[PDB]
């Protein structure tokens, strides 16, 4: 029988700050032991200060992101251009994922943004829609390496609540550099999206290409 | 230009897919009493373990008719399939015999089956809801 699933292994990481959020991912797209591309972004700005990433089978994640953005367009049309909150986006994504209960997307989804009070918020999803709000979550091939690095560096050690944006960016960069040194599927590049009250900012860094 | 029927499998399911037997207490759920199927038939069981020839047999005539309409469209134009479909719709729409199941003579003439017999003709074939009023409600869509 035809196998409709694939694997384009990558690594993503979402962290919620005091009044900011960050969602980062490696830009390597691979098939088995081959490299499809060295810069293929997986973290997207979906509007209304919400960043999204769906790591795993790339086609399913692209379809999920496309559907969510179209739904956001219709939400703006039907509700007088009301801003979509992060919790409502999480509920919409849960419904989108569970709509494929018997033919699921093979992805793990992380979204990030600012809540109603202005605090940073990150939501993590299981492949069929089970979701939770978390302070920090790593997903993909090198999560088991990235998480201990952050746990050693930070206390959830200066507390996470008093860290600035630059310090969080440095921690993410160091963890990804270590994972690149240790994991074959991690490298080439790292892209980070930062959500604050002023909007979404993108930063890019190079990683080892071997 | 199909010969064997294709695209016969269902792509989505829901508890309210059968609009004619929806429960009045819970409109999102079906009414098992008025279904009169034995009371122990979930819809999911109809998605598995089917005879592979059943879908081919159930949709054979429709597939042949669609191929004929496509050929007419290719060779004669849009008007010929439009007229054939209009005639068939007019004949089928004004026939309402709640006490009979046999097809009309005019339908057989249109389908060129005046002197043709198949097993559907030889073998054409409760406590709740098998009366004239159910057929009236289904026909009128009320």
């Amino acid at each position: 029988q035809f196998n409709p699933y694939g694997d384009n292994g990558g690594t993503i990481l979402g962290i919620a700050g005091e009044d900011f959020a960050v969602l980062a991912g490696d830009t390597r797209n691979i098939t088995d032991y081959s490299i499809n591309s060295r810069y293929e972004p997986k973290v997207f700005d979906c509007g209304d200060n919400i960043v999204m990433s769906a790591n795993g089978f790339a086609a399913d994640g692209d379809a999920l992101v496309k559907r969510f953005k179209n739904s956001v367009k219709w939400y703006h049309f039907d509700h007088n251009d009301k801003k979509l909150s992060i919790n409502s986006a999480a509920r919409n994504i849960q419904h989108l994922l569970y709509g494929k209960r018997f033919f699921p997307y093979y992805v793990h989804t992380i979204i990030a943004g600012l809540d109603e009070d202005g605090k940073g918020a990150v939501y993590s999803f299981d492949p069929v829609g089970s979701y939770e709000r978390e302070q920090c979550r790593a997903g993909g091939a090198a999560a088991s390496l990235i998480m201990p690095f952050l746990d050693n560096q930070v206390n959830f050690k200066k507390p996470l609540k008093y860290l600035s944006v630059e310090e969080v960016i440095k921690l993410v960069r160091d963890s990804f550099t270590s994972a690149t040194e240790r994991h074959i599927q991690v490298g080439d590049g790292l892209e980070i999206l930062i959500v604050t009250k002023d909007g979404v900012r993108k930063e890019f860094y190079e990683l080892k290409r071997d | 230009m199909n010969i064997v029927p294709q695209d016969t499998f269902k792509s989505q399911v829901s508890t309210d897919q059968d609009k004619s037997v929806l429960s009045s207490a819970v409109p999102s759920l079906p009414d098992t009493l008025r279904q009169q199927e034995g009371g122990a038939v979930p819809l999911s069981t109809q998605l598995n373990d089917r005879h592979p020839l059943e879908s081919t047999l159930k949709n054979w005539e429709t597939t042949q008719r669609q191929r004929q309409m496509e050929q007419y469209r290719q060779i004669f134009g849009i008007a010929e399939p439009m007229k054939r479909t209009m005639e068939m719709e007019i004949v089928n729409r004004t026939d309402f015999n709640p006490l009979s199941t046999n097809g009309s003579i005019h339908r057989d003439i249109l389908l060129n089956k005046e002197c043709s017999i198949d097993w559907e003709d030889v073998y054409p074939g409760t406590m709740v809801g098998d009366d004239v009023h159910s057929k009236i409600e289904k026909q009128l869509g009320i």
Binding site: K66, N70, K73, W74, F77 | -
Partner: protein, 234 residues
């Protein structure tokens, strides 16, 4: 008297060869308030006069956004305007989703004409009874179209529809050479439109409650101004 025997529906011709239900649908446009549209080589503008049921009510929305590059104003039956605006939004969404394209204004006009023609030749429904003014900006520049619910679309530099629109239309036709060359200066074009729609006022004055403006342009997405946002234009 003889017209009374041949105006029952849209599938009946009169002995003289007239289709009266479509004519009545066209007449339904003048029951709505005046709207004006104009354009230059770089921008397109709509100006609408809004009406309220009474002093305790709000004013009707006459300008509806279809896509970041295209919008319209309506004059006539409200349900038909709602249906057509939703249909145009759906078509633009389909274009963007399937082809990553911005739907052309001419394509939208053709689609509207095709949709409107069907109701004028079949039994069961009625013809649409709302006129539309469509503005947009695409790879061919700025475009203004007038849609008549008989199933007709025309491309113009400027026009006006609704009650007493003749004065605004005459003013626009007289001063065509003025606003045809207002390139890169949106304020002058909006002011010309405001003067044109003021030409159609009868014992009424433009306020920040009954005036609505919309503009689209080369680097300007379709934007609607209401309330204080039009105060400087009065």
């Amino acid at each position: 008297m003889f017209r009374n025997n041949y105006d029952g529906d849209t599938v009946t011709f009169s002995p003289t060869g007239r289709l009266f239900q479509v004519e009545y649908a066209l007449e339904a446009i003048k029951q709505g308030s005046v709207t004006v549209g104009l354009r230059s080589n770089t921008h397109a503008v709509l100006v609408a006069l809004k009406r309220n049921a009474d002093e305790l009510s709000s004013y009707q929305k006459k300008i509806i956004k279809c896509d970041e590059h295209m919008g319209l104003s309506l004059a006539g039956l409200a349900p038909d305007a709602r249906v057509l605006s939703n249909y145009l939004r759906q078509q633009c969404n389909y274009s963007s989703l399937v082809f990553n394209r911005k739907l052309a204004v001419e394509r939208a006009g053709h689609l509207l004409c095709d949709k409107a023609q069907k109701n004028t030749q079949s039994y069961g429904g009625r013809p649409y009874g709302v006129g539309l003014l469509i503005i947009g900006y695409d790879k061919s520049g700025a475009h203004l179209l007038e849609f008549q619910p008989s199933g007709n679309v025309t491309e113009l530099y400027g026009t006006a529809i609704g009650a007493r629109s003749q004065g605004a239309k005459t003013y626009l036709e007289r001063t065509l050479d003025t606003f045809i060359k207002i390139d890169g200066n949106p304020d002058e074009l909006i002011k010309a439109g405001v003067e044109a729609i003021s030409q159609s006022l009868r014992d009424e004055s433009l306020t920040v409650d009954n005036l609505s403006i919309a503009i689209v342009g080369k680097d300007t997405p379709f934007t609607i101004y209401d309330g204080e946002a039009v105060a400087k234009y009065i």
